[PDB]
């Protein structure tokens, strides 16, 4: 065993690794893979390069690379690409860990096919021969970083959104739903729109280029009507960003409507109902004693929820739903209703915190993991749940 | 000369003339509207394609069921479907003949009053009546004693009956129905690897369940045989040509009826509810109720359901008498047949409710009309 444990979240967009009992992750790198490519347009080789390169180096040298994403929505497309990424992160320059005497924690997305879990566990047991592994749900990995035994999670990130309400700790599987909206999609759409503006963009590397522009300029609104009238009546909200090549682009209206797809999936050809509406429906479909407790405690997890203004839009929408679908416009009784969105400052990384705290107290006792010994037997798997 | 019987099923609508042995109009209750911009201006665009057509062009429409679990939610959609069925399909004016309506038991009085008011005011029907699907099932079956298992698409309910009288105090209504089964089937199909979210794929999964689902006599034995998955998996052809392989899901979703805990509902199965309902009845009539068990509805066509119900009831009931399950092969339209037979009855020609008495008395009259 070696009393050594490393917690990782092999998600879709970014991959985080770190040791247990750590306040903040030691290493943070994204999931970028790309073979070398020469573009006849401009630029030539300047520094060293290798046939297969991944990690942070891609974020800096994507100019001469065919960057591709191995995972999206938390599902397996390219077995070899993920194998290469795992080899890289497990190499002596990213983690530098001994496979034969180490344990790991995995956080697979809720409501995913069992084939992905089976493949990943089999790969870890065979190719790298880890002594033991575990798989956990985001609910514990999130609620366990601040001491909450009840709440509703609106975890959103690259891939798809997910929800996993818990009341008094016990799980409520029959009240979880999935939607086909995430940051990648908000990106495809910043793109159709800046294309309209008249800029031609590819799907190889500029996809990563728009990431910073979305991070800085893109923001969500409070009221769609007021913001739209402001945009069409004024031009103060215009802003730009310096591209790596020095080119300058203007974006004043497209930076605002892209996040609106979250509350209006109709914009991107999805028969969705809206994050706030979905949350209200899920809460209502439950029992009664749990509705008030769920509303009182609610968390906004995931890096894709760091948009400025999302909590205000969500709370306003929820209050509107409560007013219209329950009180039929009776505002007087609506005053006492209370909501407190849980938005920790460390919303960029909270799952790693939960994994570290879990491994802090769940390391001494060996009856928690899928030990290597059980793998050699048949009639196996689904060890715990 | 005749009357029209319309059954506002939670998922389908049945209509036809009084006297015919088969319905003349069978279309699902869909009221769809365009989702896209409404851009085309040539040949055919209509603001709301609701009706039979809706199924054909469901790929660009937001299908919504007007009726949810036996209770109407949108009155405009219901009036639109009524108008469509009366005019486009039946092509019979409301004034010419009266109309018969049916509804599930233990429904709110507001729905009944609103339906009666709309029927008497908008279409000015000469007369009408409100009945229960289970009693019409008895009439269709040609029996006077038994217990009804009316497991429809939206509601499942039982109503014990005896010779010439009923037992209103032993009626149990369960919200579980075909829609919950379809939702659970979608959820499990997700666990397999196939994703379906929108309403069009909802219809696709509904068809899949209608075609490739069955009940299991023993759950554990079927699961074990599934562990040896080499003779149970079956393939279905999607409209796009993709092939989907379904294994344990065939006999998993129907088991939700006997195990409501799968969806998280703190209730009991159909067998337990029927046992409780029969036990609440008088001791002497228990023998007759056991000897006669009529079932009807579109959710009880799964092969082997009758055998499983018989086995469960015999296991629960004392093992000293005989329990018989009757499963007619035309239970889908049993309610409509019963309504037609009841309308054809000479004695019922005076029980109708006419415009004069309704106007002088008010909407509350229907409440006292046979409960």
């Amino acid at each position: 065993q070696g009393r050594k444990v490393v917690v990782c979240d092999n998600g879709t967009g970014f991959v985080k690794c770190g040791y247990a009992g750590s306040n903040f992750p030691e290493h943070i790198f994204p999931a970028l893979v790309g073979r070398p490519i020469i573009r006849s347009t401009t630029k030539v080789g300047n520094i060293e390069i290798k046939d297969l390169m991944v990690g942070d180096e891609a974020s800096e040298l994507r100019s001469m690379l065919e960057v591709n994403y191995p995972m999206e929505n938390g599902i397996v497309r390219n077995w070899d690409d993920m194998k290469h990424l795992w080899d890289y992160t497990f190499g002596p320059e990213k983690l530098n860990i001994d496979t034969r005497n180490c344990k790991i924690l995995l956080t697979e997305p809720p409501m995913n096919p069992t084939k992905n879990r089976e493949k990943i566990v089999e790969v870890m047991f065979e190719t790298y021969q880890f002594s033991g592994v575990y798989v956990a749900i985001q609910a514990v990995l999130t609620l366990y970083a601040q001491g909450l035994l009840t709440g509703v999670v609106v975890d959103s990130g690259d891939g798809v959104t997910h929800i996993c309400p818990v009341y008094e700790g016990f799980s409520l599987p029959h009240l979880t739903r999935r939607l086909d909206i995430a940051g990648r999609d908000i990106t495809r759409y910043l793109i159709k729109l800046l294309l309209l503006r008249g800029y031609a963009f590819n799907h190889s590397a500029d996809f990563e280029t728009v990431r910073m522009i979305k991070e800085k300029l893109c923001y969500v609104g409070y009221n769609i009507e007021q913001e739209q009238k402001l945009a069409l009546e004024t031009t103060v909200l215009v802003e730009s960003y310096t591209l790596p090549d020095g080119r300058i682009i203007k974006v004043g209206g497209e930076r605002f409507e892209a996040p609106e797809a979250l509350f209006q999936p109709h914009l991107i050809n999805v028969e969705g109902v809206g994050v706030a509406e979905l949350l209200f429906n899920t809460i209502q479909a439950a029992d009664i004693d749990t509705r008030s407790e769920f509303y009182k405690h609610i968390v906004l997890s995931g890096g894709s929820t760091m948009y400025p203004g999302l909590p205000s839009r969500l709370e306003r929408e929820l209050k509107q739903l409560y007013l219209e679908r329950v009180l039929k416009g009776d505002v007087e009784k609506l005053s006492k209703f209370k909501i407190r969105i849980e938005d920790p400052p460390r919303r960029k990384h909270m799952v790693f915190l939960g994994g570290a705290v879990l491994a802090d107290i769940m390391k001494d006792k060996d009856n928690f993991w899928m030990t290597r010994q059980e793998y050699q037997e048949k009639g196996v798997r689904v060890l715990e749940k | 000369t005749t009357a029209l019987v319309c059954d506002n099923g939670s998922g389908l609508v049945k209509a036809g003339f009084a006297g015919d042995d088969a319905p003349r109009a069978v279309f699902p209750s869909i009221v769809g509207r365009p989702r896209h911009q409404g851009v085309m201006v040539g040949m055919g665009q209509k603001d709301s394609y609701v009706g039979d057509e809706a199924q054909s062009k469901r790929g660009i429409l937001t299908l919504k069921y007007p009726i949810e679990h036996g209770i109407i939610t949108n009155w405009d959609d219901m009036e639109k479907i009524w108008h469509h069925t009366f005019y486009n399909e039946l092509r019979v004016a409301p004034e010419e003949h009266p109309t018969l309506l049916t509804e599930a038991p233990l429904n709110p009085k507001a729905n009944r009053e609103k339906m009666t008011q709309i029927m008497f005011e908008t279409f000015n029907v000469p007369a009408m009546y409100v009945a229960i699907q289970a009693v019409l099932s008895l009439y269709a079956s040609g029996r006077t004693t038994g217990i009804v298992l009316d497991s429809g698409d939206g509601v499942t309910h039982n109503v014990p009956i005896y010779e010439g009288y009923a037992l209103p105090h032993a009626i149990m209504r369960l919200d579980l129905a075909g829609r919950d089964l379809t939702d659970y089937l979608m959820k499990i199909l997700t666990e397999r690897g196939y994703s379906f979210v929108t309403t069009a794929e909802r219809e696709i999964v509904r068809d899949i369940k209608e075609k490739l689902c069955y009940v299991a006599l023993d759950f554990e034995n079927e699961m074990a045989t599934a562990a040896s998955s080499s003779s149970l998996e079956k393939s279905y052809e999607l409209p796009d040509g993709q092939v989907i392989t379904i294994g344990n899901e065939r006999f998993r979703c129907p088991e939700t009826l006997f195990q409501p805990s799968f969806i998280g509902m703190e209730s009991a199965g159909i067998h337990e509810t029927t046992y409780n309902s029969i036990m609440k009845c008088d001791i002497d009539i228990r023998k007759d109720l056991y000897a006669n068990n009529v079932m009807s509805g579109g959710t009880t066509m799964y092969p082997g359901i009758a055998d499983r119900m018989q086995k469960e009831i015999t296991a629960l009931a004392p093992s000293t008498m005989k329990i018989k399950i009757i499963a007619p092969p035309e239970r889908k339209y049993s309610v409509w047949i019963g309504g037609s037979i009841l309308a054809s009855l000479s004695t019922f020609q005076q029980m109708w409710i006419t415009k004069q008495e309704y106007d002088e008395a008010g909407p509350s009259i229907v409440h006292r009309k046979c409960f």
């Binding site: 999206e72 599902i75 497309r77 096919p113 891939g159 | 690897g193 196939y194 994703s195 794929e201 993709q242």
Partner: peptide, 7 residues
């Protein structure tokens, strides 16, 4: 995914 959506 395998059926429905890409992944």
């Amino acid at each position: 995914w395998x059926a429905x959506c890409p992944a």
